[PDB]
Amino acid sequence: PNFLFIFMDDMGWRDLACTGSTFYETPNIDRLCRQGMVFANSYASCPVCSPSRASYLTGQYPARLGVTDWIDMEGTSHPLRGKLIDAPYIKHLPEGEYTIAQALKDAGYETWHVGKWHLGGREYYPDHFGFDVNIGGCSWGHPHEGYFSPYGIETLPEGPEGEYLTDRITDEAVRLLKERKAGGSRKPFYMNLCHYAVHTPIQVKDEDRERFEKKAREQGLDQETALVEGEFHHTEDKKGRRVVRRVIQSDPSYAGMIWNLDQNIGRLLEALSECGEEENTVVVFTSDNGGLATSEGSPTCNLPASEGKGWVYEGGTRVPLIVKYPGHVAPGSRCDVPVTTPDFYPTFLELAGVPQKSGIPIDGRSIVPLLAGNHMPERPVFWHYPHYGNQGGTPAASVVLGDYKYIEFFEDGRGELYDLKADFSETNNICENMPEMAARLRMLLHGWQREVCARFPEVNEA
Amino acid sequence: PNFLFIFMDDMGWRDLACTGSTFYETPNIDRLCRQGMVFANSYASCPVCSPSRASYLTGQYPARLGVTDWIDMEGTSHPLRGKLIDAPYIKHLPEGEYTIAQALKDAGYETWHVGKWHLGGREYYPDHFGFDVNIGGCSWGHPHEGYFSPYGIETLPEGPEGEYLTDRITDEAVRLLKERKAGGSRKPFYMNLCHYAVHTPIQVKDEDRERFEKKAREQGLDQETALVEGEFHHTEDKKGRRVVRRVIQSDPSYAGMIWNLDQNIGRLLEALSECGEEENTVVVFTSDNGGLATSEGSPTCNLPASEGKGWVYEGGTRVPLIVKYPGHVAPGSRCDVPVTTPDFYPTFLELAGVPQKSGIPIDGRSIVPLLAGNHMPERPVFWHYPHYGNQGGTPAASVVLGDYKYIEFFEDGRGELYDLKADFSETNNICENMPEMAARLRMLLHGWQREVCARFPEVNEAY
Ligand SMILES: [Ca+2]
Ligand SMILES: [Ca+2]
């Protein structure tokens, strides 16, 4: 069984037509959804980039790993400072880790990483962690020199001037498939396809931008207040600047990026079938964190889930998830059991038939039963973000268990309890109406924190 | 507060952009949803028309009223017959029901019915049930003579040649709004606006249809297979015909009908604001049963909810629900607690400060705690549809409780159990895996059935 893991950057939970978008159009991804299972309660294990990507590669929670913030490679930003100081974090995937690429490669797989990496400098590139190929992956968190050739990526040779990064990365993925077919498909492959989309700057071809300016016109959206200024930011480096929340999906350039992305998923999936590998490829479409909605241009909206990237509220942790596996997963099905990033590692091992290495810690759970149509025992899901981020949040930790969600904020020690079944949008803090429910979820969160050795932000005495 | 209850016909749970549509465009309704509470687990109390509309007006489950099938005013088709015989039902709203129109009128409201009625002949028109006005409601369940003027609708005077009925029904609602303003708004109004949209036949202006042929071609959907033939029907009158399921949302004419419906909703709410009534009007958008996905043209698809109109599966009972009440409902929020059609009666009465009459049964439960952001105690939700219907189902009854749904099928007494949390699309019957859970749900359904005096289909001994 091949694994094709399509990992979007910063794609919010309502950023697909098939997961609830009111403006964006994603016909090729919609088809994939029709051919597989979609997950309504799909989470990333962190509200920003590198920790969720480290959690994916290791099947571990970010705090057990030590990578709990997005990696600022040249220390010009972290640690951020407010009333608290950002906690320190390991600025790369820790060296001793045994990744899913290593496990699968040890079990006979071809392992390819394509696209965004963001897990350290050259000593911690994909090749040191079980990957045979690295096309376009480096230490950058986004296209530092834009989406148009030249890109500046040391592991991606430049294309003709005017080449679009998202198109080229797809070509690179299509090239690996056809190459493998030419050599006889000796081994099952494992592709970690990490798009640079849809991270800022939102740079798109003009035909794709204009498409959705016309639609926003004929739809009336051009006349609707999309951005709304809110509170002041919380760190010294943004003193004076206010949080700008986007309250409606209407951004035409952002829609164009997603339209272009959808054509590329079309190209990619058509190559996979042209290689006679559709029947036996597990296809996963997901994202590393929630949509960007509260700063840096606010290209998208995640309402009725609150806020977005950088926040521990639902809008920042929720994420689309489609899984297709012909013959095994029922097409056009849906599952509502909470699923999180560290779950894929043991899922893939179970689908490959490969035992776990003794003694490595695994915080995730194989979702193979859900992919079959069966419930599983209730388990909590956790977050621990002891940083501010750039988007408006403040350091916090979180547990979801059943219908309830507990959040504690490190600035003032306060807790917030939500009944997400009755109150999906987190409008009604019921901490004090249910002290008992709060105390259980608070203690559960603290015990997990002790077990994974979480670090906490220290007060700022300046 | 005023009540603008917008009651669509046969609109599936995924037929709006703001509730998961992949093709349809509903800007004016998306804005409504951005201004209120959307309900992710919204249910109609019956998979076909008349029982749910009777259940909405009286706050009782259809099996208690006796109206358990859509009303067939000629003896053309009911009772349908296969292995079993359709059960008898009352073909009108029963005489002594104290409906929410009466309850609010007696509390000083002005009451208006506009549009589809389908609750009996002349002696059971809205005026016999507490409404002061009835524009366009008769015994018809759909535009017998089409959506383009003339309509032959006994309570709607014909419009100029080519007038579109949904445009016209909206114009009548706007008129009532402006008349009340001219008169100085002496009383709060309760408006029961029942569109005939989106019932077959799917007739639309060509500019609307052509806009979504264009869209289907730019998205590639025009060259996909959208309709799939299936099992045979189950009744003598459709012997030889096969269920035809729609598997994608791609029908341009239906898309065009929802697009016109969206313009008119925009006109109506604009008029609501132009009369300065926006801030103190409870606005509800919902529908009477699930979308038509399996017969009679299969205009929409309800997937991942299986099947549609006329089945007790999720696609037949799930329905969109948005509630807007400025200053009271948080704008752009979302509740996942199951709500069902008979809840509106006690919700509206509580919102208006009116006590419910003594000694009248009410199976519904006010949802104002949910409109406030508060949870309520867990309750089961029930269905009793002892008829075949036209869309390919078989007589069945149903209870949803927490994460579990149990279905009993009258043809053979087989039971079906689904974990709707793990298995939303009802893929995996776990009745034999969790026997105690099944027996508990079965006995609760049977006890409810006893208490409401539900009737059961008879075996057709000639089969
Ligand atoms: Ca990211
Ligand atoms: Ca109906």
Stretch (H or E) spanning A189? strand A189-194
Inter-residue contact B203 to B223 (CB < 8 Å): no
SS (H, E, C) B382-415: EEEECCCCCCCCCCEEEEEECCEEEEEECCCCEE
Q: Considering only alpha carbons, which residue of chain B is nearest residue A339?
A: B422
A315 vs B203: CA distance, rounded Å? 40
Q: Considering only alpha carbons, which residue of chain B is nearest residue A376?
A: B422
CA of B349 to the centre of ligand 2 (A): 25
Q: How many helices (H) and strands (E) does chain A have?
A: 11, 16
B83 vs B350: CA distance, rounded Å? 45
The reply to whether A226 touches chain B by the CB within 8 Å rule is no
Angle ∠(A308,B320,B117) on CA atoms, nearest 5: 160
Q: Give every CB contact of residue A436 below 8 A, 6+ residues apart in sequence.
A: none
Bond before B79 cis per omega within 30 degrees:
yes
B445 vs B398: CA distance, rounded Å? 7
Q: How far A128 CA lies from chain B's nearest CA (Å)?
A: 38
- The ligand minimizing its distance to the Cα of A389 is 1
A391 vs A10: CA distance, rounded Å? 12
Stretch (H or E) spanning A194? strand A189-194
Q: How far B97 CA lies from chain A's nearest CA (Å)?
A: 32
Q: For tokens 């430049």, name the residue.
A: A158
In chain B, what is the greatest distance between 2 CA atoms, to the nearest angstrom?
A: 65
Q: Give every CB contact of residue A454 below 8 A, 6+ residues apart in sequence.
A: A63, A68, A384, A386, A397
Closest CA to B263 of B22, B14, B30, B7: B30
CB neighbour class for B273 (10 Å; exposed up to 12, middle 13-18, buried from 19): exposed
Inter-residue contact B294 to B391 (CB < 8 Å): yes
Q: Give every CB contact of residue B456 below 8 A, 6+ residues apart in sequence.
A: B87, B386, B410
Q: Which of A13, A217, A367, A424 would you mutate first to test chain B, the one with the most B CBs within 10 A?
A: A424
A77 vs A390: CA distance, rounded Å? 10
- Other CB atoms closer than 10 Å to residue B242's CB: what's the count? 13
- The type of residue at B234 is H
Q: Which of B14, B225, B424, B429 would you mutate first to test chain A, the one with the most A CBs within 10 A?
A: B424
CA of A46 to the centre of ligand 1 (A): 10
Inter-residue contact A315 to A307 (CB < 8 Å): yes
Inter-residue contact B383 to B46 (CB < 8 Å): yes
B64 vs B87: CA distance, rounded Å? 14
CA of A363 to the centre of ligand 1 (A): 21
Q: For tokens 């760190």, name the residue.
A: A235
Chain A contacts of B219, Cβ < 8 Å? 25, 27
Q: How far A450 CA lies from chain B's nearest CA (Å)?
A: 31
A190 vs A195: CA distance, rounded Å? 16
Q: Which of B22, B335, B378 would you mutate first to test chain A, the one with the most A CBs within 10 A?
A: B22
The reply to whether A27 touches chain B by the CB within 8 Å rule is yes
- The ligand minimizing its distance to the Cα of A390 is 1
A265 vs A7: CA distance, rounded Å? 11
A441 vs B451: CA distance, rounded Å? 40
CB pair distance less than 8 Å for A424 and B40: yes
A70 vs A103: CA distance, rounded Å? 25
Q: A48 in helix, strand or coil?
A: coil
Chain A contacts of B430, Cβ < 8 Å? 374
Domain extent listing, chain B: 2-376
B-proximal residues of A, 55-114, CB under 8 Å: none
Closest CA to B386 of B452, B299, B329: B452
How many alpha carbons fall within 13 Å on the CB side of residue A73? 17
Resolution reached, in Å? 2.6
SS (H, E, C) chain B: CEEEEEEECCCCCCCCHHHCCCCCCCHHHHHHHHCCEEECCEECCCCCHHHHHHHHHHCCCHHHHCCCCCCCCCCCCCCCECCEECCCCCCCCCCCCCCHHHHHHHCCCEEEEEECCCCCCHHHCHHHHCCCEEECCCCCCCCCCCCECCCCCCCCCCCCCCCEHHHHHHHHHHHHHHHHHHCCCCCCEEEEEECCCCCCCCCCCHHHHHHHHHHHHHCCHHHCCCEEEEEECCCHHHCCCEEEEECCCCCHHHHHHHHHHHHHHHHHHHHHHHCCCHHHEEEEEEECCCCCCCCCCCCCCCCCCCCCCCCCCHHHHECCCEEECCCCCCCCEEECCCEEHHHHHHHHHHHCCCCCCCCCCCCCCCCHHHHHCCCCCCCCEEEEECCCCCCCCCCEEEEEECCEEEEEECCCCEEEEEECCCCCCCCCCCCCCCHHHHHHHHHHHHHHHHHHCCCCCEECCCC
Q: How far A178 CA lies from chain B's nearest CA (Å)?
A: 25
Helix intervals (H) in A190-283: 206-219, 252-274
Residue A375 has its nearest CB partner, among B28, B332, B419, at: B419
Q: A175 in helix, strand or coil?
A: helix
A449 vs B4: CA distance, rounded Å? 50
At residue B229, φ and ψ (nearest 5 deg) are -80, 145
Domain B2-376 in CATH 3.40.50.9100: no
CB pair distance less than 8 Å for A373 and B337: no
CB pair distance less than 8 Å for B304 and A375: no
CA of B51 to the centre of ligand 2 (A): 9
B112 vs B169: CA distance, rounded Å? 13
Structure tokens, A244: 């700008």
DSSP string over A96-126: T---HHHHHHHTT-EEEEEE---S-SGGGSG
A238 vs A81: CA distance, rounded Å? 10
CB pair distance less than 8 Å for B424 and A336: yes
Q: Give every CB contact of residue A49 below 8 A, 6+ residues apart in sequence.
A: A9, A10, A70, A71, A118, A141, A288, A289
